[PDB]
Amino acid sequence: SYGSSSQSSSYGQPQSGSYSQQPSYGGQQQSYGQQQSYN
Amino acid sequence: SYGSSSQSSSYGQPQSGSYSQQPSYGGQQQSYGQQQSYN
Amino acid sequence: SYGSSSQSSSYGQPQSGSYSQQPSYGGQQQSYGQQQSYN
Amino acid sequence: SYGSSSQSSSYGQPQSGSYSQQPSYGGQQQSYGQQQSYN
Amino acid sequence: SYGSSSQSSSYGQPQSGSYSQQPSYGGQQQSYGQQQSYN
Amino acid sequence: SYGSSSQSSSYGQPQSGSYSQQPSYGGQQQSYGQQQSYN
Amino acid sequence: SYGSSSQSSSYGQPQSGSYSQQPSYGGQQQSYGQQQSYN
Amino acid sequence: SYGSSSQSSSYGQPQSGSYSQQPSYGGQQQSYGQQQSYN
């Protein structure tokens, strides 16, 4: 009688190039873990 | 009768390039862990 | 009859490049851990 | 009959580059841990 | 020489039922509007 | 030589039901409006 | 040579029901408006 | 050669119900407006 969720993200040595435009923007993550009961 | 959620994020040696534009912006994360009951 | 949530974030040796623009801005994180009951 | 939340953040040797702009701005974190009951 | 994007969302009289579980969670939206040029 | 983005959201008379669980949680929105050039 | 972004949100007469649980939590919004150039 | 961002939020007659739990929590908003140049 339970719910569970998990998210994992990782980056390795990002932005190592030279003479260039390397802007970085994070994204969106949503994790839902729940148990619901009615009456 | 429970709910659980977990999120993990990691970065390794970011922004090591030279002579470049390397701006960094964080993103959005939402974690929901709950148990609900009605009556 | 409980809810739980956890978030973990880490950075390793960030901003080590030379002769460059390396601005850093934090992001947004929201963690919800709760138990609700009606009547 | 309880709710719990936890957030952990860490940084390792940040801002070690030379001859560069390395401004640092913190982000936003919100943790909610509560138990609610009606009637 | 331009890019444009727009998103619109609306809800009308939501959650009006009685004696029920009506939890509401928002979703994710991403809008990109930009112009890029190389050399 | 420009980029533009816009997002609009609206709610009308939300949470008007009786004898019920009507929790409300906001979602995530990301708008990007920018112009980039290289050399 | 410019970037622009805008976000608008509105709520009308929220939480008007009786004898119920009507908790309200705000969400996350991120707006980026910028112009970048390299060399 | 400029960047601009704007966010607007409004609420109308919130929390008008009777005999109920109507807790209110604000959310998170981030606005970025800037112009960057390298060399």
Short mmCIF file of C-alpha atoms in Angstrom, two decimals:
data_model
loop_
_atom_site.label_atom_id
_atom_site.label_comp_id
_atom_site.label_asym_id
_atom_site.label_seq_id
_atom_site.Cartn_x
_atom_site.Cartn_y
_atom_site.Cartn_z
CA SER A 1 0.00 0.00 0.00
CA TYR A 2 2.61 2.54 -1.09
CA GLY A 3 3.96 4.48 -4.05
CA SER A 4 7.55 5.45 -4.82
CA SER A 5 9.46 7.39 -7.47
CA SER A 6 13.08 8.36 -8.04
CA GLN A 7 15.03 10.41 -10.57
CA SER A 8 18.79 10.60 -11.11
CA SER A 9 20.76 12.90 -13.41
CA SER A 10 24.50 13.44 -13.87
CA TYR A 11 26.93 15.37 -16.06
CA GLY A 12 30.62 14.64 -16.74
CA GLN A 13 33.20 17.38 -17.41
CA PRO A 14 30.74 19.67 -19.29
CA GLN A 15 31.80 22.83 -21.17
CA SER A 16 35.47 22.09 -21.92
CA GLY A 17 35.66 23.45 -25.50
CA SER A 18 37.57 26.63 -26.35
CA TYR A 19 36.75 29.75 -28.39
CA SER A 20 33.00 29.10 -28.51
CA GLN A 21 29.59 29.88 -27.03
CA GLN A 22 28.66 27.26 -24.46
CA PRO A 23 25.66 28.53 -22.46
CA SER A 24 23.95 26.01 -20.16
CA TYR A 25 20.32 25.98 -19.01
CA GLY A 26 18.76 23.45 -16.63
CA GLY A 27 15.51 21.66 -17.53
CA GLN A 28 12.38 20.56 -15.63
CA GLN A 29 11.84 17.44 -13.51
CA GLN A 30 8.71 16.31 -11.64
CA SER A 31 8.51 13.32 -9.32
CA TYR A 32 5.27 12.07 -7.80
CA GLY A 33 5.20 9.44 -5.05
CA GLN A 34 1.93 8.97 -3.20
CA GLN A 35 -0.77 6.65 -1.92
CA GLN A 36 -4.45 7.62 -2.08
CA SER A 37 -7.58 6.01 -0.67
CA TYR A 38 -11.27 6.95 -0.77
CA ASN A 39 -13.65 5.86 1.98
CA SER B 1 0.19 3.37 3.58
CA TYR B 2 2.91 5.80 2.54
CA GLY B 3 4.40 7.70 -0.39
CA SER B 4 8.03 8.55 -1.08
CA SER B 5 10.05 10.42 -3.69
CA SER B 6 13.72 11.26 -4.19
CA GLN B 7 15.79 13.24 -6.68
CA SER B 8 19.57 13.30 -7.14
CA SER B 9 21.66 15.53 -9.40
CA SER B 10 25.43 15.94 -9.78
CA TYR B 11 27.98 17.78 -11.93
CA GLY B 12 31.64 16.93 -12.52
CA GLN B 13 34.33 19.57 -13.14
CA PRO B 14 31.99 21.94 -15.08
CA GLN B 15 33.19 25.06 -16.94
CA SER B 16 36.85 24.19 -17.61
CA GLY B 17 37.17 25.52 -21.20
CA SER B 18 39.20 28.64 -22.02
CA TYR B 19 38.53 31.78 -24.07
CA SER B 20 34.77 31.25 -24.27
CA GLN B 21 31.36 32.15 -22.87
CA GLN B 22 30.28 29.58 -20.31
CA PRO B 23 27.28 30.96 -18.39
CA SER B 24 25.44 28.50 -16.12
CA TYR B 25 21.79 28.60 -15.05
CA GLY B 26 20.09 26.12 -12.70
CA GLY B 27 16.80 24.44 -13.66
CA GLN B 28 13.59 23.46 -11.83
CA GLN B 29 12.91 20.36 -9.71
CA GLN B 30 9.70 19.34 -7.90
CA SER B 31 9.34 16.37 -5.59
CA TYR B 32 6.03 15.23 -4.13
CA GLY B 33 5.82 12.62 -1.38
CA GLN B 34 2.49 12.26 0.40
CA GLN B 35 -0.31 10.03 1.62
CA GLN B 36 -3.95 11.13 1.38
CA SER B 37 -7.16 9.63 2.73
CA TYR B 38 -10.81 10.69 2.54
CA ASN B 39 -13.29 9.69 5.24
CA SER C 1 0.43 6.73 7.17
CA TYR C 2 3.24 9.08 6.17
CA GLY C 3 4.86 10.91 3.28
CA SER C 4 8.53 11.65 2.66
CA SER C 5 10.66 13.44 0.09
CA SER C 6 14.37 14.16 -0.33
CA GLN C 7 16.55 16.07 -2.79
CA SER C 8 20.34 16.01 -3.16
CA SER C 9 22.55 18.16 -5.39
CA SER C 10 26.34 18.44 -5.68
CA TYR C 11 28.98 20.20 -7.78
CA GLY C 12 32.64 19.23 -8.28
CA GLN C 13 35.41 21.78 -8.86
CA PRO C 14 33.19 24.22 -10.86
CA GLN C 15 34.54 27.29 -12.70
CA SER C 16 38.18 26.31 -13.29
CA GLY C 17 38.61 27.61 -16.87
CA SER C 18 40.76 30.66 -17.66
CA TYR C 19 40.23 33.82 -19.74
CA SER C 20 36.46 33.40 -20.01
CA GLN C 21 33.05 34.41 -18.69
CA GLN C 22 31.84 31.89 -16.14
CA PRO C 23 28.84 33.37 -14.29
CA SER C 24 26.88 30.98 -12.07
CA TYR C 25 23.21 31.20 -11.07
CA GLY C 26 21.38 28.79 -8.74
CA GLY C 27 18.06 27.20 -9.78
CA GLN C 28 14.78 26.32 -8.01
CA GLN C 29 13.96 23.26 -5.89
CA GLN C 30 10.68 22.35 -4.15
CA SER C 31 10.18 19.40 -1.84
CA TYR C 32 6.80 18.37 -0.45
CA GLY C 33 6.46 15.78 2.31
CA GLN C 34 3.07 15.53 4.01
CA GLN C 35 0.18 13.40 5.18
CA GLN C 36 -3.41 14.61 4.85
CA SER C 37 -6.70 13.22 6.14
CA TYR C 38 -10.31 14.39 5.87
CA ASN C 39 -12.88 13.48 8.52
CA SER D 1 0.66 10.12 10.73
CA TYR D 2 3.57 12.37 9.80
CA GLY D 3 5.32 14.14 6.93
CA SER D 4 9.03 14.76 6.40
CA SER D 5 11.28 16.46 3.87
CA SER D 6 15.01 17.07 3.53
CA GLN D 7 17.31 18.88 1.11
CA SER D 8 21.10 18.69 0.82
CA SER D 9 23.43 20.76 -1.36
CA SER D 10 27.23 20.92 -1.57
CA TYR D 11 29.98 22.57 -3.61
CA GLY D 12 33.61 21.48 -4.03
CA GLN D 13 36.49 23.94 -4.55
CA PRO D 14 34.39 26.44 -6.61
CA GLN D 15 35.87 29.46 -8.43
CA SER D 16 39.50 28.36 -8.93
CA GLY D 17 40.05 29.63 -12.51
CA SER D 18 42.32 32.61 -13.26
CA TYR D 19 41.95 35.78 -15.35
CA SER D 20 38.18 35.47 -15.71
CA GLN D 21 34.77 36.61 -14.47
CA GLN D 22 33.41 34.13 -11.95
CA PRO D 23 30.43 35.72 -10.17
CA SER D 24 28.33 33.40 -7.98
CA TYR D 25 24.65 33.75 -7.06
CA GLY D 26 22.69 31.41 -4.77
CA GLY D 27 19.34 29.94 -5.87
CA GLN D 28 16.00 29.18 -4.18
CA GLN D 29 15.03 26.15 -2.07
CA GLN D 30 11.69 25.35 -0.41
CA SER D 31 11.04 22.43 1.91
CA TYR D 32 7.60 21.52 3.22
CA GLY D 33 7.10 18.96 5.98
CA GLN D 34 3.68 18.81 7.61
CA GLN D 35 0.69 16.78 8.72
CA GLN D 36 -2.86 18.12 8.31
CA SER D 37 -6.22 16.84 9.51
CA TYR D 38 -9.78 18.13 9.16
CA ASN D 39 -12.44 17.32 11.76
CA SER E 1 15.22 37.76 -38.74
CA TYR E 2 13.35 36.85 -35.56
CA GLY E 3 11.69 34.01 -33.67
CA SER E 4 8.59 34.09 -31.49
CA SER E 5 6.58 31.70 -29.34
CA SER E 6 3.50 31.97 -27.12
CA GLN E 7 1.53 29.66 -24.84
CA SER E 8 -1.89 30.21 -23.27
CA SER E 9 -3.73 28.06 -20.72
CA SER E 10 -6.99 28.58 -18.84
CA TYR E 11 -9.31 26.77 -16.43
CA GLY E 12 -13.00 27.41 -15.74
CA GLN E 13 -14.63 26.82 -12.34
CA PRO E 14 -12.44 23.77 -11.47
CA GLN E 15 -13.04 21.52 -8.44
CA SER E 16 -16.76 22.09 -7.79
CA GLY E 17 -17.82 18.49 -6.97
CA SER E 18 -18.78 17.42 -3.44
CA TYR E 19 -17.81 14.49 -1.20
CA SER E 20 -14.79 13.46 -3.27
CA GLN E 21 -11.02 13.63 -3.69
CA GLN E 22 -10.09 16.41 -6.08
CA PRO E 23 -6.33 17.05 -5.83
CA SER E 24 -4.80 19.33 -8.47
CA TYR E 25 -1.22 19.34 -9.76
CA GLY E 26 0.21 21.74 -12.35
CA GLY E 27 2.15 20.44 -15.37
CA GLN E 28 5.23 21.56 -17.33
CA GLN E 29 5.48 24.19 -20.09
CA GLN E 30 8.54 25.30 -22.09
CA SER E 31 8.61 28.15 -24.57
CA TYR E 32 11.60 28.94 -26.77
CA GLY E 33 11.83 32.14 -28.81
CA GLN E 34 15.22 33.02 -30.26
CA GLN E 35 17.30 34.02 -33.25
CA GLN E 36 20.77 32.55 -33.82
CA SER E 37 23.52 33.35 -36.31
CA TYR E 38 26.99 31.94 -36.92
CA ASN E 39 29.74 34.07 -38.46
CA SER F 1 17.44 40.22 -35.11
CA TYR F 2 15.46 39.41 -31.97
CA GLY F 3 13.69 36.66 -30.06
CA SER F 4 10.54 36.85 -27.96
CA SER F 5 8.41 34.54 -25.83
CA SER F 6 5.29 34.93 -23.70
CA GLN F 7 3.20 32.72 -21.43
CA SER F 8 -0.25 33.38 -19.96
CA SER F 9 -2.20 31.32 -17.42
CA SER F 10 -5.50 31.96 -15.64
CA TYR F 11 -7.92 30.24 -13.26
CA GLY F 12 -11.61 30.99 -12.68
CA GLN F 13 -13.34 30.49 -9.32
CA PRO F 14 -11.25 27.41 -8.34
CA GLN F 15 -12.00 25.22 -5.28
CA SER F 16 -15.71 25.90 -4.74
CA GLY F 17 -16.88 22.34 -3.89
CA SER F 18 -17.96 21.35 -0.37
CA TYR F 19 -17.13 18.44 1.95
CA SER F 20 -14.08 17.31 -0.03
CA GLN F 21 -10.30 17.37 -0.36
CA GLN F 22 -9.24 20.09 -2.77
CA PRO F 23 -5.47 20.62 -2.42
CA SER F 24 -3.82 22.82 -5.07
CA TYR F 25 -0.20 22.72 -6.26
CA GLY F 26 1.35 25.04 -8.86
CA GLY F 27 3.34 23.64 -11.80
CA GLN F 28 6.49 24.65 -13.70
CA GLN F 29 6.88 27.22 -16.49
CA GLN F 30 10.03 28.21 -18.43
CA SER F 31 10.23 31.03 -20.96
CA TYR F 32 13.30 31.70 -23.08
CA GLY F 33 13.66 34.87 -25.16
CA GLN F 34 17.10 35.62 -26.55
CA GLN F 35 19.29 36.52 -29.50
CA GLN F 36 22.73 34.95 -29.96
CA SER F 37 25.55 35.66 -32.39
CA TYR F 38 29.01 34.14 -32.88
CA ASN F 39 31.84 36.17 -34.39
CA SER G 1 19.63 42.69 -31.43
CA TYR G 2 17.55 41.98 -28.34
CA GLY G 3 15.66 39.30 -26.44
CA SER G 4 12.47 39.61 -24.42
CA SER G 5 10.23 37.39 -22.31
CA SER G 6 7.06 37.89 -20.26
CA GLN G 7 4.86 35.76 -18.01
CA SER G 8 1.40 36.53 -16.64
CA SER G 9 -0.67 34.57 -14.12
CA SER G 10 -3.99 35.32 -12.43
CA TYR G 11 -6.52 33.70 -10.09
CA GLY G 12 -10.21 34.55 -9.62
CA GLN G 13 -12.03 34.16 -6.29
CA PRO G 14 -10.05 31.04 -5.21
CA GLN G 15 -10.92 28.92 -2.14
CA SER G 16 -14.63 29.70 -1.70
CA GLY G 17 -15.91 26.19 -0.83
CA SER G 18 -17.10 25.29 2.68
CA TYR G 19 -16.40 22.39 5.07
CA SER G 20 -13.34 21.15 3.18
CA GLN G 21 -9.55 21.11 2.95
CA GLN G 22 -8.36 23.76 0.53
CA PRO G 23 -4.59 24.21 0.96
CA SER G 24 -2.82 26.31 -1.68
CA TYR G 25 0.83 26.10 -2.78
CA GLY G 26 2.51 28.35 -5.37
CA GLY G 27 4.52 26.84 -8.24
CA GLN G 28 7.75 27.74 -10.07
CA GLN G 29 8.28 30.26 -12.90
CA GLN G 30 11.49 31.14 -14.77
CA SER G 31 11.83 33.91 -17.33
CA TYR G 32 14.97 34.47 -19.39
CA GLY G 33 15.46 37.59 -21.51
CA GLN G 34 18.96 38.24 -22.83
CA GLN G 35 21.24 39.04 -25.73
CA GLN G 36 24.65 37.37 -26.07
CA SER G 37 27.55 37.96 -28.45
CA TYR G 38 30.98 36.35 -28.82
CA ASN G 39 33.90 38.28 -30.29
CA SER H 1 21.81 45.14 -27.77
CA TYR H 2 19.63 44.54 -24.71
CA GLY H 3 17.62 41.95 -22.81
CA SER H 4 14.38 42.37 -20.88
CA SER H 5 12.04 40.24 -18.79
CA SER H 6 8.84 40.86 -16.83
CA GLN H 7 6.52 38.83 -14.61
CA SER H 8 3.04 39.71 -13.35
CA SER H 9 0.86 37.84 -10.85
CA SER H 10 -2.48 38.71 -9.26
CA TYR H 11 -5.11 37.20 -6.96
CA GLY H 12 -8.78 38.15 -6.60
CA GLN H 13 -10.70 37.86 -3.30
CA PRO H 14 -8.83 34.71 -2.12
CA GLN H 15 -9.84 32.67 0.95
CA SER H 16 -13.54 33.55 1.28
CA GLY H 17 -14.93 30.09 2.17
CA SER H 18 -16.23 29.28 5.67
CA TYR H 19 -15.66 26.41 8.13
CA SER H 20 -12.59 25.07 6.33
CA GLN H 21 -8.80 24.92 6.20
CA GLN H 22 -7.48 27.49 3.77
CA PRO H 23 -3.71 27.84 4.29
CA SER H 24 -1.82 29.86 1.67
CA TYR H 25 1.85 29.54 0.67
CA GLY H 26 3.65 31.69 -1.91
CA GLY H 27 5.70 30.09 -4.71
CA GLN H 28 9.00 30.88 -6.47
CA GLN H 29 9.66 33.33 -9.32
CA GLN H 30 12.94 34.10 -11.12
CA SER H 31 13.42 36.81 -13.72
CA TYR H 32 16.62 37.25 -15.71
CA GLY H 33 17.25 40.32 -17.86
CA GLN H 34 20.79 40.87 -19.10
CA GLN H 35 23.17 41.55 -21.96
CA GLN H 36 26.54 39.79 -22.18
CA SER H 37 29.51 40.26 -24.49
CA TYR H 38 32.91 38.56 -24.75
CA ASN H 39 35.92 40.39 -26.17
#
